[PDB]
Design a protein around this ligand. Structure first.
Ligand SMILES: *[C@@H]1O[C@H](CO)[C@@H](O)[C@H](O)[C@H]1NC(C)=O
Ligand SMILES: [Cu+2]
Length: 227
């Protein structure tokens, strides 16, 4: 359980969607982060993978603001303290807005995977995962925006999937957090994109899985990494 509290880009903080404050406020502030109704700081499980909730989390609506990123620049997402128990991958996707991200229909967004990190080491099951790298980095994740994609406005869909309950059907916990970016530079790729509702299925091999046993491999869920 947790959420993104802050985003660091080009030497300043863009405050996150503080899901334990702003939903209680009813004239809340404009941010680059999408609003959600996930006030339990919880997740979308496999029962919601083919619902709109999977795209940018429960009840999500676009952020009003968009942050510019330098070419091949970094976006650092800072989480609330991530529990060690919530082992799993950290996955990052972009979807083009083809216009102002604040007015996009989230149900039409077509994501391409720009980064993935999974099972890092399994010397002591359940092992050390991307989520443990995030904890070791004091609960932050650095995303590098590719230089090879067409610049424009994009949604960054940044996600932890916790697998501590994933041996049961619909036990995997997805924590997607979306922010609006203005990608800059000289690139031209328009990568093949996947609808939010086709990212994950509740029987995927990296989703329905017992992490407590020795694992020989881990198949990071979602569509193929773009390079
Ligand atoms: C996180 O930062 C705090 C001090 O701000 C430190 O006490 C903690 O040990 C840090 N680093 C890691 C790897 O957890
Ligand atoms: Cu939790």
């Amino acid at each position: 359980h947790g959420f993104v509290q802050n985003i660091v880009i080009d030497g300043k903080n863009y405050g996150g969607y503080l899901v334990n404050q702003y939903p209680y406020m009813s004239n809340p502030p404009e941010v680059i982060a999408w609003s959600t109704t996930a006030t339990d700081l919880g997740f979308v499980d496999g029962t919601g993978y083919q619902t709109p909730d999977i795209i940018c989390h429960r009840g999500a609506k676009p952020g009003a603001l968009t942050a510019p990123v330098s070419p091949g620049g970094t976006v650092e997402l800072q989480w609330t303290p991530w529990p060690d128990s919530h082992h799993g991958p950290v996955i990052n996707y972009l979807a083009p807005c083809n216009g102002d991200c604040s007015t996009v229909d989230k149900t039409q967004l077509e994501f391409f995977k720009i980064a993935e990190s999974g099972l890092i080491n399994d010397d002591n099951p359940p092992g050390i995962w991307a989520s443990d790298n995030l904890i070791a980095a004091n609960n932050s994740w650095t995303v590098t925006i590719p230089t090879t994609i067409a610049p424009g406005n994009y949604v960054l869909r940044h996600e932890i999937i916790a697998l501590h309950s994933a041996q049961n059907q619909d036990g995997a916990q997805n924590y997607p957090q979306c922010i609006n970016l203005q990608v800059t530079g000289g690139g031209s790729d328009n990568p093949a994109g996947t609808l939010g509702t086709a990212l994950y299925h509740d029987t995927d091999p990296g989703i329905l899985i017992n992490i407590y046993q020795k694992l020989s491999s881990y198949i990071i869920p979602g569509p193929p990494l773009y390079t």
